[PDB]
Assembly symmetry: C5
Homo-oligomer: 315 residues x 5
């Protein structure tokens, strides 16, 4: 996830363009056109203004990393919902634990149906709905009701409607004994369902393409002025601030490390759900929230220790 694995495709390209026009400057650039080349090394360095290109990167990247962080906070986690389903949806019997496992499956299913439409790392795991059936998130007969819906949009909201038709059926049977308990379930669904709704909206509406193009112009307009205006010309010709020939442009690479590396921060955070190294481990999070929910609402329902005293009960 470091800078050396992203920049080396552009680093060997920058050495391949710099020293090719520097070594051939000594021999292939003849004296009738070497004089034509000395007029540019004080020209391209004149308009090479490195404050506004460092300015436009600063306000663009902090727009991205604020948007990249807000994409992470709206990750669909069922952890705030598994504490309500184990609290409210009751019953030790076969039907009672079948409600709690199904209700958390619908929340786990509707986090898969949105993450397979925004993450390439999840879509390579669930390419079709047959792979969501065989994983265990959707049953065989819920795939018939899913695919017989006349809708040409994304159908990630469908299990969040099956949640409400199931939580209202548990209320009618008395497995949600209270009435604020039933309101608490639908309150904590719409917080979860809005978290799936934000990830659809950060994917639908991106950072604007022209503002991505303006910063990409400015960095790649700088590296054309830097490519020519910081060339090592002949020392014996007696120019202003030019009587040396390092024959290796050692410092200007450190301004390619830093300017293009600043832009490469914004490149891999413009769509952080991909197969990068600093991506959100979404396939880790799908297997996590599906495992710990079926642990919490099924094998931890009303399984408590004895109410025994504390160590500090009278100390």
């Amino acid at each position: 996830g470091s800078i050396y694995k992203l920049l080396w495709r552009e680093l060997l390209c920058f050495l391949g363009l710099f020293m090719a026009l520097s070594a051939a400057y000594r021999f292939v650039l003849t004296e009738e056109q070497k004089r034509y080349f000395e007029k540019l090394v004080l020209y391209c360095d004149r308009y090479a203004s490195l404050i506004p290109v460092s300015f436009v990167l600063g306000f663009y990247v902090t727009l991205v990393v604020h948007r990249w962080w807000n994409q992470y906070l709206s990750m669909p986690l069922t952890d705030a919902l598994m504490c309500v389903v184990v609290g409210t949806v009751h019953g030790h019997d076969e039907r009672g634990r079948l409600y709690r496992r199904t209700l958390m499956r619908y929340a786990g299913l509707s986090g898969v149906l949105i993450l397979r439409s925004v993450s390439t790392a999840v879509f390579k795991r669930f390419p079709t709905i047959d792979h969501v059936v065989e994983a265990g998130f959707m049953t065989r007969e819920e795939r018939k009701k899913f695919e017989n819906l006349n809708s040409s949009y994304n159908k990630y909201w469908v299990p969040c409607v099956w949640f409400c038709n199931l939580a209202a059926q548990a209320r009618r049977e008395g497995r949600i004994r209270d009435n604020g308990a039933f309101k608490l379930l639908l309150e904590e669904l719409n917080v979860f369902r809005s978290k799936c709704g934000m990830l659809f909206h950060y994917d639908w509406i991106s950072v604007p393409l022209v503002y991505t193009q303006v910063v990409t112009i400015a960095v790649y307009s700088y590296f054309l002025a830097c490519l020519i205006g910081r060339q090592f010309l002949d020392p014996a010709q007696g120019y202003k601030d030019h009587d040396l020939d390092l024959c290796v442009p050692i410092f200007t690479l450190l301004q390619f490390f830093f300017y293009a590396g600043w832009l490469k921060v914004a490149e891999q955070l413009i769509n952080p759900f991909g197969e990068d190294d600093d991506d959100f481990e979404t396939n880790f999070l799908i297997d996590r929230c599906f495992q710990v929910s079926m642990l919490a609402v099924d094998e931890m329902y009303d399984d408590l220790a004895m109410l025994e005293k504390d160590l500090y009960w009278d100390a």
Copy 2:
């Protein structure tokens, strides 16, 4: 949606103003006034300070793109409301499903009445209330009660009041069986109704016109210093840092690409509801939220699969 479709109206204008004063400088600008012109190429370049004009664009555009993003988050979506109406408003009969379809129509109607007053792409689809009647959002007799209201303001809030008079009538008939269920409906209306209220307020109160005018001065004060202070004068006259004649101002266009392109980000995001390419697809969102609501509260009400076991029921 790229930068080449917005800037070319100003790009051919900038070549038409630069080289017209550069080609006629050699011939039409005679020697008695060529000497008058050489006094300006070191003068307009002296006060051409490109750090503060790049400064004022940075803080202005990030005000816009934060306001442009906050305009998008307050888009009226009925998705958080269709999970409550299918959960609470009950009844399989003719009257029961007529409540759920009407209640989501009033939310869909009151998202149209505000988006046709803030979006030009929606107002070209619904120019009059007769086009909202014929689309299906308002019935023929709800248009009589709409137009017989003595109000000279925007009447987008009217279906959100019809929502409350209908949801309180469903409660009195027992189709909202609970009491926290009825409170949950009016709670999730005022979240939706405030989302319509924000879009009226981002439209009513804009980015201030003087702050739009300050940045427009600074960019167009720079391109008058750049138009004269970066002219290619004669090489044989022996000036400071001027003994070349490219005859094509190749780099200064790359500072017109980037400065005016930075401002053009703020131009098309100052009113993102128009007919641009990176606009919010509001006509897509109106047809989406009206279709998937009448799917969710009518054809998906209490239509569940059998409660069948998971694949991981004992694994």
Copy 3:
């Protein structure tokens, strides 16, 4: 609301100070003190650093426009409250509609009592409480209970207490039939009452006076260096980068347009409730929210169309 109506009081002042010390420089400034004046045109231009003065304006104005926008979002609007009073407070009779009109009057009254203490445009409309009685927001006998309160603070919170004593009286008589309905009323009052509380606090605590004074020093320290360090001296004396005499300082006015215009953004947004052109139209908003509330809770209570089918009922 443009920049030409705010800056012209300082624009004629800047021409009156620039060319007065430029035209009298040629004639009134004699040669024994013309030599004393040439020592300053390369001195005041030396310390004329235009990056930090453009820096301090950038972080100060974006503090203001974020505070100016947050002042607007806390505007007291009764629109979120008129949907609850028409939903919960019932009764078609004389007493029942007298509850709904009074309850929305108290919310409309307590938005006037705070906006007449923060807006000069409202205080010129309601100079005394007799003008709030004659407008119709406070009755004749509620002015006796208002003025017989031993309190030396602002009494904007008084109608929000009359709201709670009335909404608890409607609950005791059964005109609020439910119990979550009564909780929903007091929940949506404290959201409204905190909106009146924020406007009292943005008015009580301002942008700090020293931080307003630091930016006002820096702009007016720049325009003393610009007033002298950018003077047009004699061309025939042979100075560095000075052999011209435009006799009209055309570009330096474009740095007065932009620096002082940037500060004038922060001047008219430091108290946006005044009588400016880009002010919040508070007198428009007071007449709006008082009209559409008495329309919504009185003439639209339980006045619905027939529940008739949609156009898409089986399509």
Copy 4:
């Protein structure tokens, strides 16, 4: 509260250090060490870079004024709680109004116990708990239960626990008739109690001391380069851009006005609860919220005018 009362302790110090090394430069600095002094006026001015010191102040002060504003928004105000206690806690009798006055005293007491631990202006008013007893916020026998708690931490949360033991006792006696009314009281306590909890946390965790020290280095590293690199040396020695002797460094004080004044914004906002002029008037707010609460829940409980018609009842 202006800049002239904070900077004059450093302004007379800056004149006392500048002209002491300028007047003694002409006479006490002899010619063998005057030549040693001319090597520094072009050296200290060389590294005197005023863009990064203006940079580090910009991002540091806007961290402070955002934290200073967030300290103000978490001020403990009982105004959102006095509308619930007058609404829910009932009874016209002696015991009924003794509940409402005590419940708002506990909220008023627990705003004093935290503000006397974060404000020096309140701690000079309440130095001991005996001064909180004699002011009237804590009774004589609640001081016995307060001081007999084995706790070595701050005990500001103690009246917020007495609030819950009293509001649950009013519910058991039927003076809170409803059940959502009792939930609304404890909901609006934890909003108030978190407001007292934030002020303890802005006081406990400050702006980091190293980041306060970095900006203090940079400003006071600038004023050592400015103290020497902008000295007025002899005009007759013929240096670069130095042939004048104003004998009064008039412009460099305007860069001490602005750089040190920018830092002095962050000095008096790093702890805004002190005895400054732009402090939050906390002793005004303690006497305000204690007076208007005992007015609202005691002398305004169920004291309404007659329900009389509006001026616009049929117009």
Copy 5:
């Protein structure tokens, strides 16, 4: 916690690299390679641009200190939960106070299980679950149910599920007499449980490693240009702006104090839960919230003073 304890490891290193190449420049650098060294002191100072390195630090550190502050606000505090458990969970008997102490132990336990996985200062206090048993947060038999859960993830959420199975058992026995009281408990758990969930997510997702590497390049690319381009060469050779020899680079250390000290702000705030001096005192907060919760829900339950009159009861 100051800057002198962090920078001295790099401060003695910077003197050890500067004057080693300055003292040996006079003697060890012979005249055939002293001429080779004079070509670099005007070269490394040429590309030493200190505005963009001060730029990239500004936007990076304010990302950190906003993330460092948001890490602090999501600290798990049981103070908002101890007011609900003393209010709702009733009973003076042995079983009744055993519910309140256990319910606040589970909140105190689930703040330890997450802080021992994000703080090194807590993990050195609780290295194993046997040290959480012996401290008193987990009983001997709750450690059997904890370690017999088939889960390979972090099990910090386990006591928040034991909270819901206990709060639903107290409701079934009538120790939570109401129904909104039971909803208020699970509402204020999910606020607390999300606070533990954020600290797991600020630890799981950090500031991106490439953006940490870009700023570390730019500072350490500056201090190679500063190490050579600001060397004190011989005065008698007659170079541009170089005829002095301080023999102690006094000002350039003040740009190492400030640039590296700015980065050291971001170094110790990138993981503020460690054993630093400005860390969050988490071991103070664990002992605080465990002590004051067992004080508030056990020894302060229904222990009130007599309802006695105020000092201002008729004044």
